[PDB]
Each structure stands twice: as structure tokens, then as C-alpha cells.
Amino acid sequence: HMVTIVRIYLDGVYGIGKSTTGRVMASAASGGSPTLYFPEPMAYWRTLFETDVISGIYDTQNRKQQGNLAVDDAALITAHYQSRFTTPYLILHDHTCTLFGGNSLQRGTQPDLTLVFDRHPVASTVCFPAARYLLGDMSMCALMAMVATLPREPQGGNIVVTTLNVEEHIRRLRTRARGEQIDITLIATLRNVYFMLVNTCHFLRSGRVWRDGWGELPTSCGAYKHRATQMDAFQERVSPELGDTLFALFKTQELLDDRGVILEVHAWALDALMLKLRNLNVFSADLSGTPRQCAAVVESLLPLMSSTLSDFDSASALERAARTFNAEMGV
Amino acid sequence: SHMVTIVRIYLDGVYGIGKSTTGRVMASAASGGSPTLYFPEPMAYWRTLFETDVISGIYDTQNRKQQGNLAVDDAALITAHYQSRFTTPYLILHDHTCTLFGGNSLQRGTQPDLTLVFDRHPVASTVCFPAARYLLGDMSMCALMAMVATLPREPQGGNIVVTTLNVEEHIRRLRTRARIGEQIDITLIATLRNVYFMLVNTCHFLRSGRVWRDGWGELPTSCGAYKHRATQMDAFQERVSPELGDTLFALFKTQELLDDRGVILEVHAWALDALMLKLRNLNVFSADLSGTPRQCAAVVESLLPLMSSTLSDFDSASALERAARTFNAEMGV
Ligand SMILES: Cc1cn([C@H]2C[C@H](O)[C@@H](COP(=O)(O)OP(=O)(O)OP(=O)(O)OP(=O)(O)OP(=O)(O)OC[C@H]3O[C@@H](n4cnc5c(N)ncnc54)[C@H](O)[C@@H]3O)O2)c(=O)[nH]c1=O
Ligand SMILES: Cc1cn([C@H]2C[C@H](O)[C@@H](COP(=O)(O)OP(=O)(O)OP(=O)(O)OP(=O)(O)OP(=O)(O)OC[C@H]3O[C@@H](n4cnc5c(N)ncnc54)[C@H](O)[C@@H]3O)O2)c(=O)[nH]c1=O
């Protein structure tokens, strides 16, 4: 008994609908075949240790403004809690990775098993870090630090970057939290970072590498940074330029030598990013309709996705991992 | 298509023991053996390549701790951030060289076509130093987990040699560099020494073919006492037949990671699994450096019969030679 598994990482900017979405896809209410959902590791972040890292992050963007903590220092304290967000993702990823199996193909069929992970390690190792850096809240050096910890995606992974029109995105961000300030720049920049990420996988699928069109590309400075904070600045592109992708932000003096050439060690890092994101078959989804509709939109690009071949012990082991994960990541 | 036999060695252990000097000799042709490339410590990355020198910073933040001007709360957060900054260049190097070692790792008891000495394995900055900072109360168990998790998986064929030294001689050396009213910081040194014994014992335990679970639920729930004892000099040693108590696993049995029943949470057992898996491709050895640089170089060398080799190709071997040349340039001073 071999099993055909398809794994989906649902990802994108927060407050868009994605968690409702996967949670619906998982629930017995959608039909199709067995669908297991791995939720966000909330408990890990909030209750399992003395410090609640979400409550800590913003607590520091407050302090840094409230004229009470060195601006230099909140860039370190925040860098740190950004690190803490990654941990449970890396643990999950380590545990699940042996079990997905091999023989990744686009089979066209329905799989015996469907997994939906709420977010891929890329979100908290590259994307959120990249955004905090563009906002000046975190240094290049520190972005490097985090990007370096992204694990290699094994074969057959599928990442669906969820999207939404801005209007509606603001409506759903008020319905959830008010009192506290929403942070419209973080949202604007994250929207851009996620487009950049999507562009990046399309870039790689098109067979290019980060060196291609690197010389031509302009150095990326205050001007380029600020632009990533503006809304709509970037968008999905099936044939992107280098500058439409995540690599563009790494061309800065910080990483360049006396004559404008990127250091070999830094090229190595850009190399590793490109390696790690390569087994990630990229898709988009607009989360405009109702949770049930959103679900069927994700479920509709199932025939396009990458399936693996697993043995019946591991299937079982993933389902156990599913049960446990939902259980302990509780609240 | 031409087949090259590589053996890689990670020299590791407590700082100030002689390891970097040893490695430079193993590289030097005068020490015979097989051609040796030596990847040094990523100094430049840490100190010069960015606006902040992680070595200055770190201690400058332990200083503002005792010396009122910055919170005790923040120190264990800025210090952790800096500990994380130490690991970056090692992860980068690891990612660059890993896909070049090739496979077929088989302890072949002969001299290899070539030898790579890396100064330190990712384990040093993602497990060992973090573990010691936690045992000293400078860092939380949760911060620890945030770093333990970022150990990369060692591929087949990795050999790690934990360097050792009697305490007299080790201290002597420490004062030999340093110089002029600089404090040493025995406290850390003592804990790091214990952590590295825990590590040699850990991989033994694991090669033995034991898992972290064997003997777990009968092991004393480690907390207050255990932390003191980890910081006490020579509390730990290289055990011949190590048990769970002697290993790095012991320190993760704390209230912080159990439920109301005294049972480790499953997500925590997973983190424990990961670490056990990565620590399974490292062939572990210990080497003593009381001899002279040459003697030391020979002590590590004589082990080679015991070490494991991978088969790479000529074009890969030749990129390692560049890799080593590049790393050496970009990291000096
Ligand atoms: C990963 C990461 C996160 N964070 C920070 C950023 C955030 O401030 C915070 C929590 O981030 P979270 O992702 O853990 O949890 P949420 O804040 O809940 O954001 P989500 O990731 O869950 O976004 P979703 O949009 O997937 O969440 P969801 O709850 O589905 O959507 C929010 C609201 O929209 C409505 N909704 C959902 N679907 C809807 C639909 N189809 N129609 C109408 N409304 C819909 C629901 O009523 C819900 O109230 O953590 C970091 O700082 N660094 C990091 O690396
Ligand atoms: C990796 C890491 C480092 N740090 C911090 C802790 C430390 O304070 C600092 C040093 O970082 P480093 O280890 O790159 O720099 P060093 O302090 O130089 O330590 P080494 O790695 O070089 O240790 P070694 O023992 O290899 O250094 P070495 O210079 O070889 O030895 C010290 C002295 O002993 C003499 N010596 C060497 N071999 C000798 C021999 N055989 N006989 C007699 N003397 C010998 C040498 O002349 C030298 O002066 O960085 C962290 O906080 N966290 C981390 O994760």
C-alpha cells in the first residue's frame, strides 16, 4: 500500500482569511478526500513559555516610539522575537520531512491524502524579516542572520500565496483587532514582499538564477527600500525581471566590496536561498469570496499541484502529527 | 568523473585551547599527510563586515547588565540575538560546501585524496555555546530552543574532533594571548568545558545506538541543582559507557517543557528528535592538545584510520579549494 500525498503550504499577509480558509478545507464540510490541517503554532508563541512573543514584538515597537528604549536596541530586541516566531515551524518541518516521500510528479489526479500547512518556514525566515528590514526596524546583517536558517524544501512541496484586494483587506483587519494600532506600513510592505516571493519562484521556474541580470540591476538604497512600503508597488509576474524578486534587496553597499562587487560569502547566501526555494511549486489565490468559496478555489488548483509517493506507516504518522499539532498548539 | 576521496574534520571545543593553531599546522605542508584545506573562524563576518562587532556588542551588553544603564530583562534578549549572529557565517559555509562532499561515506582506513579542516561545526554556535549561556542563567530555555532548532542536518561523512586540555594548561594559554588586566571569566569556561563533554558523550550514546528516550522517565527532572552542577568545574567528563544523564538530552527535562502530568509535550519531543537525528552523522573523537603545535597536529592526524570518507568528484574538490581560498581572504584580520 503506497499513498499519494499532496502538501499545501498556505501563505501570505496576515488577516487575509488564510487560516479560516485552510481550517475550512480540512473540516469534514468540503467533500473530496481526507484533508489534514496544520494550524499556526499559537500556543508556542504565547502560552508555552514565560514570554508571549507577539505581545512582545509590538510591546517593543511601542517602547521604541514612546521615547523609552534606544531606537538602536529595539532593532535588536525585535530581531530576537522575530527569531522566536521561526522555532515551531522549523520543529514541525523537521518532524514531517522524512514522511512526505519521493517521486514528485504532477499526477493530475486527486491524492489519497491532502495536507494543508498554515504557513511555510519561508514566512518567518525570509518574508517577515525582509519586511521589518525594509521598514528600517531591523538591519541587513540581521536579515542575513534569519534568511540563513530557512530549511531546504524537500521535493514536491506546494506553496499557495493567498491574495486579496486592499479595500477588503482593511475591512477584515478592523473586524479582528481594535484600541491597538493596525500598522498599515507593515501590511503594505508585507504585501509587497509576498509578491516579490511569488515573483521569485516564477523567476526560478523560468530557469534563471540570481546572477542573471545582476550586473545590469541598480544598487538598492533608501529610494528602492521606501518603494517597497508603498501599496501596489509590486505584483504577481509570470515573467519577472530580477528586480521584481527577493534577490534585488540584497544588492546594497553593506554586501558589496570596495569596487561594487558582492562578496563571495554573500553570493553563497543568495545561492542557498535560491536552492532552498526551488522545490516550492508556486501558486496564488484571491481570498475574496466566502470561506467555503476560498476553500474550493485552493482545492481547484489541486490538479496542478505536486504529489509524492509515501509508505503507509508515514501516512499514519502524519495523521498522528496532525492530531497532536492541533492539540498542543491549542488556543 | 574522476573520483576524489575526501575526509572532512570539524575541530571543536572550548575556546583558547589551541584548536585554531592546531588546524593551521594540519594545513601546513610541513605536517605531511594528505593535502589539507583549512577553513578558519569567520572573524571578519563577526567583527568587521557589518556596522556591529558581535564580540564587542555581546560583552558590552553583559556589561550594561551588572553596570546599571540597561535592563536584566533585555540583556537575556540582546545577548541571545548576538548568540544568533555568531551562527550565521557557519550556516552559510555549511550550505555552500555540503553539496560538494559527495556521498558514499565509508570508514576506509587509508589516507584520503584530500582533507578539509573546518574550525568549528555549526553545533558549536547553535547548541553548545547557547546551552552554556542557558546553564549560566544568561539565556532562557525558550531562546535555547530557538537556536537548537537551527542546527543544520549534517550529511554523511562528517567527523568532529572535540579538542581537550587539562585546566592548568588551558588557563595558561588563555593568559598568553589576552594580556594586561583583562579578566578571563572562569565561570563560562567551566560550563563550556562541561557542555563539550556532554556533546562527546552525546554522540557516543547515539553511535552506541541508544535514543534520547531510553532512561528518560527514570532520570531526575533536571532543574535548579542540575544547572549549578553543569557550571561546576569537572562535574562532567568523557564517559566510556555514557548514559542519558551524561548527555546533552538531560538538560531538556525541565518543568518548562512538561505538562501537568510530568510528561514532555510532543512538540518538544520532536525538537528532541531533530537534534538526535542531526547528531547521528557526526563521527565523534576527542583529541588532547598538551603537546606542541606539531604534536597536536599529529594527534588529530593519527586518528584518520578511524575517520569516514566520502567520494566526491575532481570539479567539486576543486571548488572546495576555491571555497577555502575565498573564505580565508574574506575572513582575516
Ligand atoms: C508568522 C509571523 C507573524 N508575525 C505576527 C504578525 C501578526 O500580528 C501576528 C499574528 O499572526 P498570525 O498569522 O499568527 O495570526 P493572525 O493575526 O490571526 O493572522 P493570520 O495569519 O491568521 O491571517 P488570516 O487572514 O489567515 O487569519 P483569519 O483569522 O483567517 O482572518 C481574519 C478575519 O477575517 C475574517 N475572515 C476570514 N475569511 C473570511 C472570509 N472569507 N470572508 C469574510 N471574513 C473572513 C474572519 O472573521 C477573521 O475574523 O504575528 C510576526 O511578527 N512574524 C512572523 O514571522
Ligand atoms: C563560536 C562562538 C564564539 N563565541 C565567543 C567566545 C569567545 O570569547 C570568542 C572567541 O572566538 P574564536 O574562538 O573565533 O576566537 P579565539 O578566542 O581566538 O578562540 P579560538 O577558536 O582561536 O580557540 P583556539 O584555542 O583554537 O585559539 P588558539 O589561538 O589556537 O589558542 C590560544 C593560545 O594558545 C597557544 N597555543 C596553541 N597551541 C599550543 C600548543 N600546542 N602549545 C602551547 N601553546 C599553544 C597559542 O599561541 C595561542 O596564543 O567568541 C561565542 O560567544 N559564541 C559562539 O558560538
Swiss-Prot record, chain A:
Residues that bind ATP: 12-19, 172
**Coiled-coil intervals:** none
Sorted alphabetically, the keyword list is: ATP-binding, DNA synthesis, Early protein, Kinase, Nucleotide-binding, Transferase
Instruction: Spell out the InterPro entries in the cross-references.
Output: Herpes_TK (IPR001889), P-loop_NTPase (IPR027417)
Give the source's domain of life in one word: Viruses
| NAD is among the record's keywords | no
Q: Name a GO molecular-function annotation.
A: ATP binding
Gene3D superfamilies assigned: P-loop containing nucleotide triphosphate hydrolases (3.40.50.300)
- Which sites are catalytic? 40
- Per the UniProt entry, the Enzyme Commission number(s) are 2.7.1.21
Enzymatic reactions: thymidine + ATP = dTMP + ADP + H(+)
Sites where the protein binds substrate: 58, 82, 85, 128, 178
Tell me the GO BP annotations in alphabetical order: DNA biosynthetic process; TMP biosynthetic process
Q: What does this protein do?
A: Catalyzes the transfer of the gamma-phospho group of ATP to thymidine to generate dTMP in the salvage pathway of pyrimidine synthesis. The dTMP serves as a substrate for DNA polymerase during viral DNA replication. Allows the virus to be reactivated and to grow in non-proliferative cells lacking a high concentration of phosphorylated nucleic acid precursors.
Please give the subunit comment from the record: Homodimer.
Please give the family membership noted in the entry: Belongs to the herpesviridae thymidine kinase family.
Give the protein name, as stated in the record: Thymidine kinase
